[PDB]
Amino acid sequence: SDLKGPELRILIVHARWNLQAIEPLVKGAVETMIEKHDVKLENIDIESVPGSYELPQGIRASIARNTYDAVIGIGVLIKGSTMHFEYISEAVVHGLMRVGLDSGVPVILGLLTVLNEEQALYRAGLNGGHNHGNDWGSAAVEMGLKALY
Amino acid sequence: DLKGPELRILIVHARWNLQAIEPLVKGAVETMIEKHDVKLENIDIESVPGSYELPQGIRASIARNTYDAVIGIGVLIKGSTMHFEYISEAVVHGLMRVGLDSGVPVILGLLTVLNEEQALYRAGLNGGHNHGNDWGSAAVEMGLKAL
Amino acid sequence: DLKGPELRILIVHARWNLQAIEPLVKGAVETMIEKHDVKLENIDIESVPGSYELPQGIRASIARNTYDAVIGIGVLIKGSTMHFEYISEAVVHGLMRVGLDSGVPVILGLLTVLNEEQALYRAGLNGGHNHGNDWGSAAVEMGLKAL
Amino acid sequence: GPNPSDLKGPELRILIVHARWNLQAIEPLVKGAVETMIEKHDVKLENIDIESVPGSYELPQGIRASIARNTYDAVIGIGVLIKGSTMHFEYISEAVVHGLMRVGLDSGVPVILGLLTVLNEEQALYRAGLNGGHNHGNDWGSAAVEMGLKAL
Amino acid sequence: DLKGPELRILIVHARWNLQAIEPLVKGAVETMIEKHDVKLENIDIESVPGSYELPQGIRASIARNTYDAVIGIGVLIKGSTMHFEYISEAVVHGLMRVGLDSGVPVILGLLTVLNEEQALYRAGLNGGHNHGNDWGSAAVEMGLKAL
C-alpha cells in the first residue's frame, strides 16, 4: 500500500477501559497514517468514551458535528465471569457497522474481543505480537479515499 | 473532575430483583451528585416491570421530556429455560437502538449474570465494586460530550 | 395496586401447544380484571397460527385499532433441529421492534423452553407460578405509564 | 399440536418463493403448500404465483423484489438448510430468518417461514412428509391463508 | 440457459488470504463470461482491506454506479479469539441489509471456515468444487429476475 491521503480527515474514538492495550493501538494507528500515508497530524481527531458500549454512540454524535472521511472505533473487551462479554461484544460490533451504513462514513472496527489480557496485548504489538492499530490505520486511509474518488 | 450541574439525567430501572437494583440506582445517583455536581432535582428516576420494558420505557420517556443522558438499569439471571439467553440479547440491542435513534446517550446498567451472588457482588456487596457508580460517571461524561 | 378501567388491551396468542397457552391467556385476563379493574369488553383476544406470526399479527392489529398495551403470547419448545434456536431469536427481536416502532408497549408472553414440562410449570400447573398473571400486570402498568 | 382452520380464501393472491438447492425436499413442500391451499381453503390455482431463487440467501431479496411489482395477500418463503462442515449453516440460517421477518414487517405483507434448518438430509425429508413424517408445506399453506385473510 | 450480455455485475473482494480469494473471483468471472455471455467490460472488480469493509464498500460503490447484481467475496477463518464469531455474523447480516435497502441483489461470497484447508477446498483446490462458479451463476439469475 503506497496510498497517500494528505487531505483526509480521520476520527479516532477509543474507550478508556484497559489502557495498557488501548494506547499502543491508538499510537500504532496514528503513526502508520502519518508516516506511511502522509496524513496530517492536525487532521486526526482523537476522542474517547468511558467504555466500548459508548463507541457507537460517541462516533454517531461526532460525525454529526464534523466531517470525517473515515472513522476508527477502538476498544478492548475481555471475557469475564458473567455473560456480559458475550452480549455487548455482539451489540457493539453490530452497532458500529450500523453507524457506518447509516452515515455513509467508513467505520474501521478497532475492537478486540479476547479471552484474556495476554491476547489483547499480543495484538497491540507487545510480547512479539503484531500491532493491529497499524492495520486499522492503513484501512482507514484506503476506505477514506475510496469513499471520495 | 467533570462537573455537570446543568445536566438532566434519566434513570429507568426494572423492579425485578431489588436486592441488587437498589444499590445500583443509589450508587449511580450518589456518584453523580457527590462527584459531578449534578443537582438532585435534575435526576428523574422511573421504573418498569421488567428488563424487557427497559427500551420501551426509555423510548417513551425521552419523547416527553428532554434529558442529556439516560441510564438503563436491570438485572438478568440465567434460569432453567432459554429465556435468559434471548431477552438479554434483545434488551442490549434494544437500548443500543434507542440511543442511536434518538441521539441521546444510553448507559447500559444491565447485569447479565449466572446467579444472584454475581449480581450482588457487582452491586458493591460482599467486597465487590458498585457498578452503579461507574454508570453515573459515564452518564455525566456522555451528557457533556453530547453538548 | 394499579387500576386501569379505561385501558384497551390486546392479546395475540399462537395456537400451537394449547395445553400451555390457555392457562397463560386465562391468567393474563383474570389478573387484569380482578386486580386492575380492566373491563372485559376492553380486552381483545386474537390468535395466529404460530409464534412466527406474532409480530406480524400484532403489527396488523395495532394499525386497525388503538390499544394502550399489547401482549404477545406463545410457546416454543426445543425440537430435534435448529428451528427453535432461530425463530426464538427472531420473534423476541421482532416483537421488540413492533413495540418501539409503534410506540405501543408490547409485553413478551413468549416461553422458550427445553420441554413440555417447563412450559406447563410456568403456566402455573404442577406447582408452578402462572406467568400470564405477571404479564397482565405488566400490560396495565406500561399502559398507564404510556398515559 | 398445531390447530388449523376451515377458512376459505378464493380471492387471495399467494406468492411462493423457493430456493432450488436440495430439490428432493423442496418439491414435496411446495406441492403440499399448493394442494392444501387449493383443496382445503378454496384458493384458485391462477392466484398462486410460484417463483424461485438460487438459494436461501436470496429468499428475502427475491420476495422483496416480487412484492414490489405485484400485490399479494401473503407470501411463503421455502428453503432447506443443512448443517455442513463449516460455520456457513449457522450464519446464513440466522441471517435469512431475521431477513424474511424484516421483509414481512417493512412491507406489511405476511411472510410465512418455510425454511427448514436441519442437521441432516433425513430430518429434511421427514418434515417434507416422506418416510412417515408430516408435510410441513401443508401447515404453511393454511398459515398463509389465515394471515392473508386477517390482513384483509 | 441464462444469458445476460447486457448485465452489469460488481465484484467486491477483501484482500486478506489471497490464496483462496483469487480462485473464487476467477471462477465467478469465468462462469459469468463463458456460460452466461456476460461481457468482460461489464464486470467491475473492486477490493477492500478486509471482510468487515465488504458491506461498506459495496454500499459506496452501488451509490456511484448502477449494477444489476453484486457479489461480496471474502474469507473468514476461526482464530484464537472471538473475533471470527462476531464479525462473521456482522458481515453476513450487513451484506443482507445493503441488498434489501438498495434493491440490488447481493450474492454472499463469504466463506466462514474453521481452517485454511476448508477455504481452499471450497475454492476448487485439492479436489473441491469452486463456489465462485455458483456465485457467478447466481448473480446472473438474480440480475435478470430483478430485470
XYZ file of C-alpha atoms in Angstrom:
742
model
C 0.000 0.000 0.000
C 1.539 3.209 -1.338
C -1.665 5.216 -0.786
C -1.219 8.803 0.352
C -4.075 10.767 1.863
C -2.879 14.268 2.920
C -6.357 15.820 2.645
C -8.134 13.111 4.645
C -9.762 13.833 7.994
C -9.681 10.845 10.288
C -11.570 10.435 13.549
C -10.462 8.050 16.265
C -12.777 7.221 19.148
C -11.379 4.878 21.779
C -12.649 3.584 25.095
C -10.548 4.226 28.172
C -11.073 0.896 29.864
C -7.871 -1.172 29.888
C -5.302 1.379 28.697
C -2.279 -0.951 28.770
C -3.590 -2.148 25.394
C -5.544 0.861 24.070
C -2.554 3.233 23.909
C -0.321 1.008 21.715
C -3.251 0.510 19.356
C -4.140 4.211 19.070
C -0.471 5.059 18.755
C 0.081 2.474 16.074
C -2.893 3.719 14.094
C -1.764 7.351 14.192
C 1.887 6.650 13.419
C 1.012 4.480 10.429
C -1.368 7.058 8.929
C 1.224 9.816 9.280
C 4.471 8.037 8.414
C 3.148 5.730 5.715
C 0.165 7.543 4.237
C 1.098 11.220 4.569
C -1.909 12.036 6.737
C -1.567 15.334 8.617
C -1.438 15.145 12.398
C -3.697 18.200 12.586
C -6.297 16.299 10.522
C -6.540 13.478 13.050
C -9.127 13.950 15.807
C -8.779 11.652 18.801
C -11.685 11.287 21.215
C -12.594 8.881 23.998
C -15.582 7.368 25.748
C -15.978 5.500 29.079
C -16.396 2.069 27.519
C -16.907 0.050 24.342
C -20.683 0.277 24.652
C -20.417 4.011 24.034
C -18.246 3.619 20.945
C -21.191 3.602 18.506
C -22.992 6.427 20.348
C -19.904 8.603 20.560
C -18.957 8.057 16.924
C -22.505 8.799 15.823
C -22.569 12.032 17.776
C -19.216 13.136 16.456
C -19.775 12.539 12.760
C -22.901 14.693 13.079
C -20.924 17.725 14.247
C -17.921 17.478 11.951
C -16.984 15.986 8.617
C -14.656 12.994 8.565
C -13.651 10.781 5.678
C -13.157 7.669 7.800
C -13.565 6.611 11.427
C -11.807 4.104 13.679
C -13.578 2.671 16.728
C -11.010 1.272 19.132
C -11.750 -0.741 22.245
C -10.874 -3.906 24.158
C -13.363 -6.464 25.548
C -12.151 -9.358 27.710
C -14.228 -12.405 28.647
C -15.273 -12.196 32.313
C -17.174 -14.363 34.815
C -20.618 -13.348 33.564
C -22.324 -13.244 30.145
C -21.619 -9.525 29.818
C -18.733 -10.068 27.383
C -20.822 -12.182 25.038
C -23.698 -9.723 24.834
C -22.020 -6.340 24.452
C -19.344 -7.640 22.115
C -22.077 -8.526 19.670
C -24.009 -5.304 20.314
C -21.019 -3.058 19.707
C -19.886 -4.838 16.557
C -23.353 -4.714 15.076
C -23.615 -1.130 16.286
C -20.509 0.329 14.701
C -21.423 -1.459 11.484
C -24.767 0.314 11.592
C -23.429 3.796 12.184
C -21.247 3.249 9.149
C -24.005 2.208 6.777
C -26.389 4.879 8.110
C -23.987 7.779 7.726
C -22.080 6.616 4.694
C -18.823 7.147 6.520
C -16.361 4.206 6.708
C -16.013 2.769 10.182
C -12.986 0.588 10.865
C -13.520 -1.961 13.612
C -10.682 -1.429 16.089
C -12.417 -3.685 18.575
C -10.521 -6.594 20.134
C -12.782 -9.245 21.732
C -10.386 -11.522 23.613
C -10.391 -14.200 26.310
C -7.611 -12.675 28.434
C -5.210 -9.724 28.836
C -2.326 -11.520 27.148
C -4.265 -11.951 23.867
C -5.107 -8.254 23.780
C -1.544 -7.123 24.467
C -0.138 -9.505 21.868
C -2.421 -7.904 19.288
C -1.243 -4.459 20.390
C 2.244 -5.407 19.274
C 3.574 -6.330 22.718
C 5.382 -9.554 23.554
C 6.273 -10.318 19.948
C 2.811 -9.780 18.525
C 1.803 -7.549 15.616
C 0.210 -4.162 16.370
C -3.228 -4.191 14.749
C -3.542 -0.457 15.170
C -1.220 -0.250 12.190
C -3.595 -2.254 10.045
C -6.584 -0.151 11.074
C -4.644 2.977 10.184
C -3.993 1.783 6.675
C -7.557 0.556 6.295
C -8.952 3.933 7.337
C -6.943 5.677 4.626
C -7.989 3.261 1.878
C -11.661 3.428 2.747
C -11.417 7.185 3.177
C -10.041 7.592 -0.348
C -12.330 5.065 -1.986
C -15.241 6.838 -0.330
C -14.405 10.027 -2.187
C -12.879 9.335 -5.544
C -13.237 16.092 37.689
C -16.137 16.515 35.224
C -18.876 18.714 36.669
C -22.299 18.857 35.066
C -24.678 20.984 37.195
C -26.986 21.736 34.254
C -27.390 18.119 33.107
C -30.759 16.355 33.357
C -30.319 12.624 33.812
C -32.906 9.893 33.496
C -32.705 6.566 35.273
C -35.104 3.793 34.345
C -34.769 0.560 36.298
C -36.654 -2.722 36.320
C -38.218 -3.776 39.602
C -37.386 -7.433 39.384
C -34.744 -8.452 41.934
C -34.488 -5.305 44.095
C -31.840 -6.601 46.484
C -29.441 -5.756 43.652
C -31.294 -2.952 41.890
C -31.379 -0.583 44.859
C -27.589 -0.481 45.498
C -27.047 0.159 41.792
C -29.541 3.001 41.489
C -28.302 4.511 44.732
C -24.649 4.327 43.732
C -25.402 5.892 40.378
C -27.279 8.816 41.927
C -24.777 9.408 44.723
C -21.797 9.434 42.402
C -23.462 11.925 40.050
C -24.369 14.281 42.854
C -21.311 13.946 45.053
C -18.641 13.767 42.371
C -20.103 15.539 39.361
C -22.177 18.298 40.905
C -25.394 17.020 39.317
C -28.478 18.528 41.019
C -30.841 16.191 42.831
C -33.820 17.902 41.244
C -32.326 17.235 37.777
C -32.373 13.469 38.189
C -35.554 11.634 37.187
C -35.977 8.050 38.358
C -38.560 5.810 36.756
C -39.265 2.096 36.830
C -40.726 -0.638 34.652
C -41.906 -4.161 35.457
C -39.030 -5.993 33.806
C -35.888 -5.626 31.699
C -37.799 -6.267 28.517
C -39.603 -2.964 29.094
C -36.392 -1.012 29.560
C -36.109 0.018 25.879
C -39.827 0.690 25.623
C -39.918 2.731 28.801
C -36.836 4.776 27.947
C -38.115 5.483 24.413
C -41.435 6.775 25.742
C -39.743 8.944 28.339
C -37.243 10.719 26.119
C -40.152 11.623 23.876
C -41.942 13.514 26.647
C -39.020 15.274 28.272
C -35.513 16.344 27.346
C -32.608 14.514 29.001
C -28.900 14.772 28.364
C -28.185 11.159 29.161
C -30.079 8.031 30.193
C -29.199 5.009 32.298
C -30.966 1.703 31.839
C -30.654 -0.464 34.912
C -31.816 -4.050 35.288
C -30.661 -7.476 36.444
C -30.961 -10.704 34.453
C -30.047 -14.103 35.902
C -29.712 -17.343 33.960
C -32.645 -19.636 34.731
C -33.714 -23.183 33.798
C -35.008 -22.292 30.312
C -33.622 -20.321 27.332
C -35.353 -17.095 28.411
C -32.233 -15.524 29.867
C -30.277 -16.041 26.656
C -32.862 -14.488 24.351
C -34.057 -11.425 26.236
C -30.560 -10.455 27.368
C -29.573 -10.107 23.731
C -32.809 -8.348 22.832
C -32.504 -5.765 25.602
C -28.862 -4.985 24.998
C -29.523 -4.500 21.267
C -32.714 -2.571 22.047
C -31.248 0.014 24.423
C -28.409 0.452 21.952
C -31.016 1.230 19.298
C -32.976 3.789 21.268
C -29.674 5.525 21.905
C -28.742 5.756 18.245
C -32.248 6.624 17.025
C -32.787 9.445 19.474
C -29.263 10.748 19.677
C -29.471 10.602 23.463
C -26.714 8.609 25.237
C -27.965 5.433 26.867
C -25.730 3.960 29.524
C -26.067 0.182 29.871
C -26.790 -0.650 33.515
C -27.840 -4.180 32.697
C -26.179 -7.037 34.550
C -26.476 -10.406 32.865
C -25.267 -12.861 35.479
C -25.356 -16.621 36.070
C -26.502 -16.364 39.685
C -27.676 -13.973 42.387
C -24.226 -13.843 44.013
C -22.594 -12.353 40.914
C -25.301 -9.709 40.755
C -24.822 -8.566 44.358
C -21.023 -8.576 44.085
C -21.303 -6.110 41.207
C -23.711 -4.024 43.271
C -20.875 -3.471 45.711
C -21.937 -6.038 48.307
C -19.664 -8.744 49.700
C -16.449 -6.905 48.873
C -17.406 -6.121 45.295
C -17.329 -2.815 43.442
C -20.627 -0.967 42.884
C -21.041 -0.570 39.124
C -23.813 1.964 39.542
C -21.015 4.343 40.356
C -19.289 3.771 37.014
C -22.577 4.197 35.214
C -23.153 7.519 36.947
C -19.841 8.930 35.835
C -20.384 7.563 32.331
C -23.753 9.256 32.010
C -22.269 12.593 33.043
C -19.389 12.338 30.553
C -21.612 11.332 27.641
C -24.071 14.002 28.663
C -21.414 16.701 28.400
C -19.765 15.446 25.227
C -23.179 15.342 23.583
C -23.096 19.100 24.317
C -52.455 -1.752 43.182
C -52.804 -0.022 39.783
C -56.287 0.370 38.339
C -56.882 0.891 34.637
C -60.630 0.718 33.833
C -60.291 2.788 30.633
C -57.416 0.739 29.204
C -57.810 -1.220 25.970
C -55.580 -4.289 25.901
C -54.763 -6.590 23.012
C -53.704 -10.195 23.395
C -52.458 -12.163 20.423
C -51.583 -15.782 21.049
C -50.263 -18.565 18.852
C -52.370 -21.713 18.703
C -49.526 -24.197 18.791
C -49.481 -26.165 22.042
C -52.730 -25.056 23.699
C -52.285 -27.139 26.868
C -49.984 -24.281 27.933
C -51.394 -21.279 26.019
C -54.881 -21.391 27.544
C -53.695 -21.205 31.166
C -51.452 -18.276 30.234
C -54.125 -16.305 28.394
C -56.632 -17.017 31.162
C -54.193 -15.950 33.867
C -53.417 -12.763 31.973
C -57.081 -11.817 31.543
C -58.186 -12.718 35.071
C -55.351 -10.764 36.650
C -56.183 -7.638 34.643
C -59.873 -7.847 35.502
C -59.733 -8.933 39.126
C -56.733 -6.905 40.272
C -56.570 -3.921 37.925
C -60.227 -3.209 37.196
C -59.793 -3.651 33.437
C -63.126 -4.206 31.685
C -63.718 -7.491 29.892
C -65.184 -5.588 26.907
C -61.914 -3.727 26.655
C -59.756 -6.800 26.150
C -59.318 -8.024 22.583
C -58.055 -11.557 22.110
C -56.757 -12.700 18.740
C -54.697 -15.623 17.508
C -52.238 -16.610 14.826
C -51.021 -19.993 13.575
C -47.649 -19.893 15.302
C -45.100 -17.746 17.124
C -43.521 -16.577 13.908
C -46.707 -14.682 13.031
C -46.855 -12.998 16.443
C -45.026 -9.838 15.348
C -46.869 -9.719 12.040
C -50.260 -10.247 13.652
C -49.616 -7.660 16.359
C -48.429 -5.112 13.783
C -51.523 -5.554 11.632
C -53.908 -5.219 14.566
C -52.415 -2.098 16.129
C -52.749 -0.432 12.731
C -56.524 -1.007 12.661
C -57.421 -0.255 16.274
C -55.998 1.704 19.167
C -54.627 -0.202 22.145
C -52.776 1.018 25.218
C -50.733 -2.136 25.622
C -50.266 -5.487 23.941
C -49.291 -8.997 24.976
C -47.692 -11.481 22.615
C -48.227 -14.994 23.946
C -46.646 -18.115 22.508
C -44.725 -21.261 23.455
C -41.545 -22.542 21.773
C -40.009 -25.907 22.656
C -36.557 -27.079 21.584
C -37.008 -29.793 18.929
C -34.588 -32.011 17.007
C -33.452 -29.356 14.566
C -32.115 -25.815 14.920
C -35.581 -24.371 14.276
C -36.115 -23.482 17.950
C -32.885 -21.564 18.246
C -33.526 -19.445 15.156
C -37.179 -18.425 15.366
C -36.967 -17.837 19.114
C -34.411 -15.130 18.481
C -36.362 -13.739 15.538
C -39.631 -13.472 17.433
C -38.121 -11.861 20.511
C -36.300 -9.290 18.403
C -39.382 -8.800 16.209
C -41.948 -8.093 18.954
C -39.381 -5.730 20.465
C -39.355 -3.899 17.148
C -43.090 -3.579 16.658
C -43.183 -2.109 20.138
C -40.506 0.549 19.504
C -41.753 1.419 16.025
C -45.365 1.826 17.030
C -44.789 3.345 20.430
C -47.234 0.838 21.925
C -45.962 -1.313 24.803
C -45.561 -4.977 23.867
C -45.354 -7.438 26.737
C -43.360 -10.540 25.840
C -45.531 -13.520 26.747
C -43.198 -15.901 24.971
C -41.908 -19.043 26.695
C -38.754 -20.537 25.137
C -38.422 -23.885 26.927
C -36.471 -27.141 26.555
C -39.511 -29.351 27.047
C -43.248 -29.500 27.643
C -42.959 -29.853 31.415
C -41.124 -26.492 31.740
C -43.818 -24.810 29.722
C -46.685 -26.156 31.849
C -44.885 -25.299 35.089
C -44.685 -21.688 34.001
C -48.359 -21.815 33.111
C -48.969 -22.416 36.797
C -49.580 -26.175 36.547
C -47.853 -28.779 38.718
C -46.987 -26.295 41.455
C -45.524 -23.631 39.192
C -46.437 -19.951 39.011
C -48.676 -18.750 36.148
C -46.672 -16.137 34.244
C -49.703 -14.859 32.390
C -50.521 -13.123 35.663
C -47.235 -11.254 35.636
C -47.791 -10.271 32.019
C -51.258 -8.987 32.748
C -49.984 -6.752 35.489
C -47.157 -5.584 33.241
C -49.566 -4.697 30.470
C -51.559 -2.498 32.809
C -48.583 -0.625 34.211
C -46.999 0.022 30.822
C -50.399 1.051 29.502
C -50.873 3.688 32.183
C -47.296 4.948 32.096
C -47.689 5.378 28.336
C -50.597 7.514 29.577
C -50.090 -29.872 18.374
C -50.911 -27.248 15.646
C -54.563 -26.169 15.338
C -55.618 -25.368 11.716
C -58.714 -23.641 10.267
C -61.576 -24.342 7.787
C -61.087 -20.881 6.282
C -61.839 -20.200 2.623
C -59.944 -17.590 0.611
C -60.960 -17.677 -3.092
C -59.914 -14.065 -3.736
C -56.478 -14.327 -2.135
C -53.286 -13.996 -4.197
C -50.445 -16.062 -2.745
C -46.800 -15.911 -3.741
C -44.390 -18.790 -3.197
C -40.656 -18.260 -3.469
C -38.452 -21.328 -3.031
C -34.730 -21.954 -3.354
C -33.685 -24.682 -5.768
C -30.936 -26.179 -3.655
C -31.837 -29.690 -2.493
C -34.995 -30.351 -4.534
C -35.627 -33.807 -3.086
C -37.169 -31.890 -0.185
C -38.298 -28.615 -1.813
C -40.777 -30.199 -4.240
C -42.859 -32.113 -1.658
C -43.082 -28.945 0.464
C -44.109 -26.641 -2.402
C -46.583 -29.237 -3.640
C -48.025 -29.660 -0.145
C -48.376 -25.940 0.308
C -50.197 -25.588 -3.025
C -52.518 -28.583 -2.747
C -53.527 -27.620 0.812
C -54.424 -24.074 -0.214
C -56.480 -25.243 -3.175
C -58.226 -28.321 -1.786
C -58.815 -27.075 1.750
C -59.062 -23.287 1.502
C -60.588 -22.780 -1.957
C -57.639 -20.777 -3.275
C -57.591 -20.548 -7.071
C -54.724 -22.085 -8.994
C -54.487 -18.918 -11.091
C -53.989 -16.907 -7.936
C -50.886 -18.742 -6.825
C -47.576 -17.427 -8.180
C -44.531 -19.642 -7.780
C -41.025 -18.244 -8.191
C -37.551 -19.478 -7.358
C -34.071 -18.271 -6.466
C -30.612 -19.874 -6.448
C -30.512 -20.358 -2.703
C -31.943 -19.428 0.687
C -29.803 -16.322 0.958
C -31.760 -14.821 -1.916
C -35.114 -15.655 -0.357
C -35.586 -12.269 1.358
C -34.164 -10.403 -1.634
C -36.390 -12.271 -4.076
C -39.542 -11.860 -2.025
C -38.835 -8.157 -1.551
C -38.436 -7.540 -5.273
C -41.573 -9.502 -6.131
C -43.937 -7.854 -3.652
C -42.851 -4.512 -5.070
C -44.012 -5.425 -8.565
C -47.286 -7.175 -7.784
C -49.821 -7.299 -4.974
C -50.051 -10.401 -2.835
C -52.044 -11.057 0.311
C -49.485 -13.428 1.776
C -46.078 -14.880 0.936
C -44.314 -18.139 1.720
C -40.540 -18.399 1.699
C -39.454 -22.011 1.227
C -35.916 -23.311 1.591
C -33.780 -26.019 3.152
C -30.532 -25.513 5.088
C -28.419 -28.440 6.271
C -25.538 -28.187 8.747
C -22.246 -28.659 6.893
C -18.556 -28.852 7.796
C -18.061 -25.117 8.242
C -19.900 -22.354 10.105
C -21.833 -21.366 6.971
C -25.054 -23.040 8.179
C -25.116 -21.260 11.499
C -24.617 -17.831 9.934
C -26.923 -17.801 6.954
C -29.746 -19.533 8.769
C -29.834 -16.709 11.247
C -29.472 -14.087 8.513
C -32.321 -15.479 6.419
C -34.846 -15.978 9.241
C -34.222 -12.435 10.513
C -34.364 -11.269 6.897
C -37.735 -12.704 5.908
C -39.099 -11.426 9.194
C -37.954 -7.942 8.217
C -39.420 -8.002 4.721
C -42.697 -9.005 6.270
C -42.768 -6.117 8.776
C -41.473 -3.462 6.357
C -43.974 -4.224 3.622
C -46.914 -5.144 5.793
C -47.367 -8.385 3.847
C -47.479 -11.652 5.825
C -44.423 -13.801 5.245
C -44.664 -17.457 6.208
C -41.351 -19.086 7.174
C -40.988 -22.189 5.021
C -37.367 -22.589 5.993
C -36.068 -25.881 7.372
C -32.806 -25.612 9.310
C -31.808 -29.258 9.799
C -28.732 -31.241 10.812
C -29.044 -33.784 8.008
C -30.919 -34.753 4.858
C -33.057 -37.271 6.712
C -34.556 -34.599 9.006
C -35.467 -32.520 5.965
C -37.240 -35.323 4.124
C -39.088 -36.405 7.244
C -40.501 -32.902 7.561
C -41.368 -32.950 3.884
C -43.780 -35.774 4.639
C -41.508 -38.603 3.488
C -40.629 -41.712 5.486
C -43.613 -41.357 7.802
C -43.120 -37.685 8.586
C -45.667 -34.862 8.348
C -45.500 -32.490 5.363
C -44.947 -29.008 6.747
C -45.777 -27.402 3.435
C -49.341 -28.226 4.338
C -49.113 -26.233 7.573
C -47.513 -23.301 5.765
C -50.302 -23.215 3.200
C -53.013 -22.913 5.822
C -50.925 -20.304 7.650
C -50.594 -18.203 4.515
C -54.351 -18.283 4.019
C -55.151 -17.264 7.603
C -52.662 -14.413 7.681
C -53.825 -13.325 4.262
C -57.427 -13.048 5.446
C -56.717 -11.437 8.796
C -54.605 -8.903 6.903
C -57.807 -8.185 4.896
C -29.513 -21.445 -20.415
C -29.479 -17.986 -18.792
C -27.646 -15.426 -20.896
C -27.161 -11.877 -19.682
C -24.985 -9.895 -22.152
C -26.394 -6.534 -21.018
C -25.863 -7.138 -17.284
C -23.511 -5.071 -15.173
C -22.022 -7.045 -12.304
C -19.974 -5.735 -9.394
C -17.455 -7.841 -7.503
C -16.019 -6.553 -4.240
C -13.489 -8.780 -2.526
C -11.386 -8.478 0.602
C -7.641 -8.853 0.131
C -6.987 -10.942 3.206
C -5.954 -14.517 2.428
C -5.451 -14.324 -1.332
C -4.550 -17.991 -1.849
C -8.326 -18.545 -1.657
C -9.762 -15.223 -2.855
C -8.224 -15.366 -6.338
C -9.585 -18.797 -7.358
C -13.058 -17.706 -6.219
C -13.006 -14.343 -8.031
C -11.616 -16.091 -11.099
C -14.254 -18.810 -11.048
C -17.020 -16.252 -10.626
C -15.850 -14.153 -13.579
C -15.139 -17.079 -15.921
C -18.504 -18.714 -15.298
C -20.393 -15.458 -15.940
C -18.498 -14.904 -19.193
C -18.217 -18.434 -20.606
C -21.625 -19.742 -19.520
C -23.852 -16.677 -19.295
C -22.481 -14.431 -22.048
C -21.646 -11.621 -19.657
C -19.225 -9.122 -21.214
C -15.846 -8.762 -19.541
C -16.098 -4.977 -19.848
C -19.350 -5.104 -17.874
C -17.783 -6.726 -14.800
C -16.347 -4.269 -12.264
C -13.958 -5.777 -9.753
C -13.054 -3.876 -6.583
C -11.351 -4.654 -3.274
C -11.328 -3.706 0.389
C -8.851 -4.376 3.210
C -10.968 -6.952 4.997
C -14.370 -8.610 5.216
C -15.640 -6.020 7.662
C -15.487 -3.368 4.927
C -17.356 -5.531 2.444
C -20.799 -4.066 3.216
C -19.370 -0.542 3.452
C -17.513 -0.878 0.167
C -20.453 -2.331 -1.716
C -22.725 0.396 -0.373
C -20.413 3.164 -1.560
C -19.990 1.598 -4.999
C -23.662 0.986 -5.826
C -24.284 4.622 -4.912
C -21.918 5.858 -7.648
C -22.780 3.442 -10.439
C -25.687 1.246 -11.465
C -25.230 -2.514 -11.260
C -27.731 -5.311 -11.792
C -26.188 -7.652 -9.222
C -23.342 -7.625 -6.710
C -21.070 -10.323 -5.284
C -19.275 -9.901 -1.992
C -16.362 -12.269 -1.674
C -14.293 -12.768 1.443
C -12.814 -15.452 3.659
C -13.024 -15.687 7.445
C -11.149 -18.341 9.407
C -11.688 -19.114 13.095
C -8.799 -17.778 15.168
C -7.746 -17.829 18.824
C -10.135 -15.120 19.969
C -13.854 -14.492 19.497
C -13.205 -12.157 16.562
C -14.251 -14.718 13.944
C -17.623 -15.357 15.614
C -18.541 -11.699 15.913
C -17.600 -10.262 12.560
C -18.832 -13.289 10.630
C -22.277 -12.559 11.923
C -21.918 -8.799 11.402
C -20.840 -9.118 7.797
C -23.481 -11.680 6.836
C -26.193 -9.507 8.341
C -24.683 -6.401 6.777
C -24.445 -7.589 3.189
C -28.014 -8.782 3.523
C -29.069 -5.304 4.606
C -27.299 -3.465 1.790
C -29.098 -5.792 -0.575
C -32.553 -5.088 0.874
C -32.018 -1.333 1.306
C -30.782 -0.721 -2.208
C -32.921 -3.223 -4.012
C -29.795 -4.610 -5.654
C -29.149 -8.375 -5.388
C -26.111 -9.130 -3.254
C -24.639 -12.617 -3.615
C -22.939 -13.909 -0.448
C -19.422 -14.913 -1.484
C -18.248 -15.082 2.102
C -16.692 -18.295 3.399
C -16.701 -18.705 7.195
C -14.349 -21.650 7.802
C -12.557 -23.317 10.715
C -9.238 -23.582 8.862
C -7.321 -22.726 5.698
C -7.836 -26.182 4.173
C -11.643 -25.787 4.252
C -11.422 -22.481 2.407
C -9.094 -23.806 -0.290
C -11.273 -26.875 -0.800
C -14.251 -24.630 -1.450
C -12.140 -22.598 -3.834
C -11.911 -25.693 -6.009
C -8.441 -26.706 -4.814
C -7.495 -30.213 -3.681
C -10.463 -31.903 -5.326
C -13.050 -29.464 -4.036
C -15.624 -27.536 -6.034
C -15.103 -23.841 -6.788
C -18.024 -21.976 -5.245
C -17.099 -18.832 -7.143
C -18.757 -20.582 -10.055
C -22.069 -20.945 -8.249
C -21.935 -17.305 -7.144
C -21.451 -16.179 -10.710
C -24.465 -18.053 -11.997
C -26.459 -16.817 -9.001
C -25.524 -13.215 -9.739
C -26.701 -13.598 -13.330
C -30.014 -15.153 -12.374
C -30.852 -12.532 -9.741
C -29.731 -9.789 -12.093
C -32.197 -10.887 -14.738
C -35.095 -11.585 -12.383
C -34.528 -8.100 -10.983
C -34.913 -7.019 -14.638
